Write an enzyme that holds these catalytic residues in place. Sequence first.
Site, PDB file in Angstrom:
ATOM      1  N   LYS A  51     -14.832  11.335 -25.845  1.00 16.31           N
ATOM      2  CA  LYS A  51     -15.406  10.110 -26.485  1.00 16.31           C
ATOM      3  C   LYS A  51     -15.124   8.982 -25.892  1.00 16.31           C
ATOM      4  O   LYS A  51     -13.925   8.577 -25.544  1.00 16.31           O
ATOM      5  CB  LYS A  51     -15.203  10.284 -28.096  1.00 16.31           C
ATOM      6  CG  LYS A  51     -16.029   9.233 -28.804  1.00 16.31           C
ATOM      7  CD  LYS A  51     -16.148   9.408 -30.193  1.00 16.31           C
ATOM      8  CE  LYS A  51     -16.920   8.706 -31.048  1.00 16.31           C
ATOM      9  NZ  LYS A  51     -16.953   8.706 -32.480  1.00 16.31           N
ATOM     10  N   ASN A  88     -13.546  -1.707 -38.734  1.00 13.02           N
ATOM     11  CA  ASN A  88     -12.624  -0.544 -39.197  1.00 13.02           C
ATOM     12  C   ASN A  88     -11.213  -0.947 -38.139  1.00 13.02           C
ATOM     13  O   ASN A  88     -11.282  -0.863 -37.087  1.00 13.02           O
ATOM     14  CB  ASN A  88     -12.728   0.498 -39.490  1.00 13.02           C
ATOM     15  CG  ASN A  88     -12.787   1.299 -38.015  1.00 13.02           C
ATOM     16  OD1 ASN A  88     -11.594   2.101 -37.673  1.00 13.02           O
ATOM     17  ND2 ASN A  88     -13.892   1.303 -37.391  1.00 13.02           N
ATOM     18  N   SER A  89     -10.123  -1.126 -38.970  1.00 19.29           N
ATOM     19  CA  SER A  89      -8.812  -1.029 -38.223  1.00 19.29           C
ATOM     20  C   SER A  89      -7.825  -0.035 -38.727  1.00 19.29           C
ATOM     21  O   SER A  89      -6.924  -0.158 -39.317  1.00 19.29           O
ATOM     22  CB  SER A  89      -8.010  -2.132 -38.033  1.00 19.29           C
ATOM     23  OG  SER A  89      -7.996  -2.798 -39.540  1.00 19.29           O
ATOM     24  N   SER A 105     -10.689   4.850 -29.116  1.00 20.05           N
ATOM     25  CA  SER A 105     -10.412   4.239 -30.309  1.00 20.05           C
ATOM     26  C   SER A 105      -9.732   2.653 -30.036  1.00 20.05           C
ATOM     27  O   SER A 105      -8.939   2.504 -29.046  1.00 20.05           O
ATOM     28  CB  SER A 105      -9.323   4.786 -31.335  1.00 20.05           C
ATOM     29  OG  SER A 105      -9.000   3.772 -32.344  1.00 20.05           O
ATOM     30  N   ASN A 137     -17.830   5.260 -29.091  1.00 27.23           N
ATOM     31  CA  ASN A 137     -17.102   4.770 -29.925  1.00 27.23           C
ATOM     32  C   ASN A 137     -17.330   3.378 -30.356  1.00 27.23           C
ATOM     33  O   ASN A 137     -18.504   2.809 -29.887  1.00 27.23           O
ATOM     34  CB  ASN A 137     -15.782   4.839 -29.827  1.00 27.23           C
ATOM     35  CG  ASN A 137     -14.575   5.250 -30.781  1.00 27.23           C
ATOM     36  OD1 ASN A 137     -14.806   4.603 -31.825  1.00 27.23           O
ATOM     37  ND2 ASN A 137     -13.761   6.295 -30.576  1.00 27.23           N
ATOM     38  N   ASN A 193      -8.471   0.782 -31.907  1.00 28.89           N
ATOM     39  CA  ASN A 193      -7.144   0.616 -32.982  1.00 28.89           C
ATOM     40  C   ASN A 193      -5.891   1.197 -32.571  1.00 28.89           C
ATOM     41  O   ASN A 193      -5.140   1.162 -33.582  1.00 28.89           O
ATOM     42  CB  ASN A 193      -7.738   0.890 -34.329  1.00 28.89           C
ATOM     43  CG  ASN A 193      -8.830   0.111 -34.641  1.00 28.89           C
ATOM     44  OD1 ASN A 193      -9.043  -0.857 -34.459  1.00 28.89           O
ATOM     45  ND2 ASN A 193     -10.116   0.783 -35.337  1.00 28.89           N
ATOM     46  N   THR A 194      -5.772   1.942 -31.559  1.00 23.12           N
ATOM     47  CA  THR A 194      -4.489   2.647 -31.159  1.00 23.12           C
ATOM     48  C   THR A 194      -4.143   1.668 -29.683  1.00 23.12           C
ATOM     49  O   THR A 194      -4.872   1.951 -28.920  1.00 23.12           O
ATOM     50  CB  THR A 194      -4.447   4.119 -30.799  1.00 23.12           C
ATOM     51  OG1 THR A 194      -4.648   4.519 -32.206  1.00 23.12           O
ATOM     52  CG2 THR A 194      -3.119   4.204 -30.336  1.00 23.12           C
ATOM     53  N   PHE A 230      -6.056   5.830 -37.062  1.00 18.67           N
ATOM     54  CA  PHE A 230      -5.609   7.348 -36.969  1.00 18.67           C
ATOM     55  C   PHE A 230      -4.915   7.895 -38.439  1.00 18.67           C
ATOM     56  O   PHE A 230      -4.055   8.431 -38.150  1.00 18.67           O
ATOM     57  CB  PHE A 230      -5.211   7.815 -35.712  1.00 18.67           C
ATOM     58  CG  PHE A 230      -5.891   7.856 -34.526  1.00 18.67           C
ATOM     59  CD1 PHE A 230      -7.265   7.806 -34.514  1.00 18.67           C
ATOM     60  CD2 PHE A 230      -5.400   7.939 -33.489  1.00 18.67           C
ATOM     61  CE1 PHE A 230      -8.053   7.927 -33.561  1.00 18.67           C
ATOM     62  CE2 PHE A 230      -6.082   8.002 -32.152  1.00 18.67           C
ATOM     63  CZ  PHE A 230      -7.376   7.934 -31.989  1.00 18.67           C
ATOM     64  N   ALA A 280     -17.204  11.502 -35.830  1.00 20.50           N
ATOM     65  CA  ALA A 280     -15.685  11.786 -36.378  1.00 20.50           C
ATOM     66  C   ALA A 280     -15.244  10.549 -37.042  1.00 20.50           C
ATOM     67  O   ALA A 280     -15.976   9.383 -36.922  1.00 20.50           O
ATOM     68  CB  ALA A 280     -14.865  11.799 -34.896  1.00 20.50           C
ATOM     69  N   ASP A 303     -15.018  12.551 -42.153  1.00 19.51           N
ATOM     70  CA  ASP A 303     -14.124  13.436 -42.983  1.00 19.51           C
ATOM     71  C   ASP A 303     -12.972  13.722 -41.928  1.00 19.51           C
ATOM     72  O   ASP A 303     -12.859  14.949 -41.341  1.00 19.51           O
ATOM     73  CB  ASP A 303     -14.749  14.838 -43.402  1.00 19.51           C
ATOM     74  CG  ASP A 303     -14.078  15.584 -44.078  1.00 19.51           C
ATOM     75  OD1 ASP A 303     -12.812  15.213 -44.616  1.00 19.51           O
ATOM     76  OD2 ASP A 303     -14.449  16.764 -44.378  1.00 19.51           O
TER      77      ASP A 303
HETATM   78  C1  FMN Z   1     -14.141   3.693 -40.663  1.00 21.38           C
HETATM   79  C2  FMN Z   1     -14.518   4.520 -39.557  1.00 21.38           C
HETATM   80  C3  FMN Z   1     -13.465   5.345 -38.817  1.00 21.38           C
HETATM   81  C4  FMN Z   1     -13.687   5.934 -37.753  1.00 21.38           C
HETATM   82  N1  FMN Z   1     -12.806   7.013 -37.160  1.00 21.38           N
HETATM   83  C5  FMN Z   1     -13.002   7.723 -36.007  1.00 21.38           C
HETATM   84  C6  FMN Z   1     -12.079   8.712 -35.430  1.00 21.38           C
HETATM   85  O1  FMN Z   1     -11.259   8.922 -36.431  1.00 21.38           O
HETATM   86  N2  FMN Z   1     -12.558   9.015 -34.536  1.00 21.38           N
HETATM   87  C7  FMN Z   1     -13.647   8.593 -33.855  1.00 21.38           C
HETATM   88  O2  FMN Z   1     -14.004   9.334 -32.545  1.00 21.38           O
HETATM   89  N3  FMN Z   1     -14.507   7.946 -34.189  1.00 21.38           N
HETATM   90  C8  FMN Z   1     -14.053   7.359 -35.472  1.00 21.38           C
HETATM   91  N4  FMN Z   1     -15.080   6.419 -35.792  1.00 21.38           N
HETATM   92  C9  FMN Z   1     -16.575   5.801 -34.897  1.00 21.38           C
HETATM   93  C10 FMN Z   1     -17.410   6.768 -35.323  1.00 21.38           C
HETATM   94  O3  FMN Z   1     -17.263   8.128 -35.103  1.00 21.38           O
HETATM   95  C11 FMN Z   1     -18.684   6.384 -34.683  1.00 21.38           C
HETATM   96  O4  FMN Z   1     -18.415   6.599 -33.201  1.00 21.38           O
HETATM   97  C12 FMN Z   1     -19.191   4.926 -34.863  1.00 21.38           C
HETATM   98  O5  FMN Z   1     -18.809   4.668 -36.136  1.00 21.38           O
HETATM   99  C13 FMN Z   1     -20.678   4.622 -34.173  1.00 21.38           C
HETATM  100  O6  FMN Z   1     -21.544   5.050 -35.007  1.00 21.38           O
HETATM  101  P1  FMN Z   1     -22.326   4.305 -35.819  1.00 21.38           P
HETATM  102  O7  FMN Z   1     -22.715   3.038 -35.472  1.00 21.38           O
HETATM  103  O8  FMN Z   1     -23.570   5.259 -36.215  1.00 21.38           O
HETATM  104  O9  FMN Z   1     -21.395   3.918 -37.224  1.00 21.38           O
HETATM  105  C14 FMN Z   1     -14.891   5.596 -36.907  1.00 21.38           C
HETATM  106  C15 FMN Z   1     -15.823   4.694 -37.401  1.00 21.38           C
HETATM  107  C16 FMN Z   1     -15.369   4.128 -38.661  1.00 21.38           C
HETATM  108  C17 FMN Z   1     -16.547   3.077 -39.139  1.00 21.38           C
HETATM  109  O1  ORO Z   2      -8.723   5.396 -36.868  1.00 22.18           O
HETATM  110  C1  ORO Z   2      -9.227   4.507 -36.247  1.00 22.18           C
HETATM  111  O2  ORO Z   2      -8.983   3.220 -36.448  1.00 22.18           O
HETATM  112  C2  ORO Z   2     -10.587   4.548 -35.346  1.00 22.18           C
HETATM  113  C3  ORO Z   2     -10.528   5.512 -34.395  1.00 22.18           C
HETATM  114  C4  ORO Z   2     -11.845   5.656 -33.473  1.00 22.18           C
HETATM  115  O3  ORO Z   2     -11.904   6.462 -32.736  1.00 22.18           O
HETATM  116  N1  ORO Z   2     -12.541   4.771 -33.722  1.00 22.18           N
HETATM  117  C5  ORO Z   2     -12.868   3.600 -34.684  1.00 22.18           C
HETATM  118  O4  ORO Z   2     -13.361   3.020 -34.767  1.00 22.18           O
HETATM  119  N2  ORO Z   2     -11.760   3.817 -35.484  1.00 22.18           N
END
Ligand code: FMN
Ligand code: ORO
Length: 376
Positions: A238, A119-120, A190, A267, A192-193, A123, A70, A73
């Site tokens: 998650k 990232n911050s 998350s 996460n 960031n909320t 959502f 997630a 996209d």
């Molecule tokens: C820019 C960014 C945005 C993300 N947004 C979400 C999100 O909206 N919902 C979610 O469950 N995880 C979100 N994640 C977390 C990823 O889904 C994933 O759990 C996390 O990046 C760890 O995987 P990785 O080490 O392969 O990057 C986000 C991660 C990044 C870097």
């Molecule tokens: O939208 C985000 O900031 C976000 C959501 C999430 O679930 N995980 C994350 O790292 N960022």
Amino acid sequence: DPFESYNPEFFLYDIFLKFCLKYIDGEICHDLFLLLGKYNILPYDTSNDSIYACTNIKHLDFINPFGVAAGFDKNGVCIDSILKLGFSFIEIGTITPRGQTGNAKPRIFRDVESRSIINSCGFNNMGCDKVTENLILFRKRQEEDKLLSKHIVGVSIGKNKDTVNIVDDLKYCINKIGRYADYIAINVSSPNTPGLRDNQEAGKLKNIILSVKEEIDNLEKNFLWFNTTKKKPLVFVKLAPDLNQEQKKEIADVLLETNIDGMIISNTTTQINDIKSFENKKGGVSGAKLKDISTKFICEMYNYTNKQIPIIASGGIFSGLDALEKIEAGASVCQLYSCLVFNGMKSAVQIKRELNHLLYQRGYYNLKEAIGRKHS
Ligand SMILES: Cc1cc2nc3c(=O)[nH]c(=O)nc-3n(C[C@H](O)[C@H](O)[C@H](O)COP(=O)(O)O)c2cc1C
Ligand SMILES: O=C(O)c1cc(=O)[nH]c(=O)[nH]1
Ligand SMILES: Cc1cc([C@@H](C)NC(=O)c2[nH]cc(-c3c[nH]c4cc(C(F)(F)F)ccc34)c2C)no1
């Protein structure tokens, strides 16, 4: 061969990626990826996935073990192109009932040396109604498309920045998008909320899971399932990696009591503070520095749940060996994010080849045999 043919390993995408990683703001690169996918310019993986590397979670039959996590996209605007890079599934979202912009830019930063992201975002998304329309259009293309017939789409749901009671927002999203989803991921993790991760406390989490399962079960009371499974969506949660052992155990008890279908571990983390270029930055960290934290978390939860709750691995997976480590720890399937950012278009083709090689070298008949084998 990266030079003789347009395919996921095409050399120019590597040249361009190395340019972007050096010189271009992260979210701008991501917007360019989504632009290329939106117009279906990106290359396709046309190869049969190995039958010996397929996996399942209940009736979800993944043609291969690698999906996109997630947050990649968020609005479901290029589901097709991402899947056709060679992935078996994608989790779109996290979405909220109303569209919102998230936090002020710049809010995403990369550290190439350590393959890490912070990232911050907050959502940011177009909102449930619009993302539902995008997913419906995908489902209509999917009915005619030889390449997409067995691909799985999940939807991650959260709450708007202003919402008091998260369950109201989860219910709105389920009623709008649930019938187009193969699974729903409940995002209570998350960083960031503010306050969202408090919903991992056992009492609150239990009420959230039961409310979500009830709202999904009420959809048939009110042709129905326009998804891949043709069945009501499964429910995953998650989880955040920054929990102590007492919290992990009480969560495991709730996951067993509520018959949740799976858990996504994990996460981003707030406890990595040894990345120089991140020193004054806010948010959760992804990538290679999350790998060990999240693998250990998988082992812990697999054991705390007596191996009864399937696990989707997320965190620092770049290579076939990283994937096998997650699987042997207890995961049935893996999600990539940072791998796409740092290895690019070839990510799925390469990691599938590398895992098939390891399964041979290690003497496994198929991937299912490897699930949880560290603990045997
Ligand atoms: C820019 C960014 C945005 C993300 N947004 C979400 C999100 O909206 N919902 C979610 O469950 N995880 C979100 N994640 C977390 C990823 O889904 C994933 O759990 C996390 O990046 C760890 O995987 P990785 O080490 O392969 O990057 C986000 C991660 C990044 C870097
Ligand atoms: O939208 C985000 O900031 C976000 C959501 C999430 O679930 N995980 C994350 O790292 N960022
Ligand atoms: C949300 C959210 C995520 C982000 C950050 C973490 N995402 C990225 O850094 C990112 N995402 C995808 C690519 C990419 C791979 N391969 C590419 C190839 C091209 C080409 F130039 F060739 F077109 C462009 C981009 C890429 C990159 C570098 N920001 O916001």
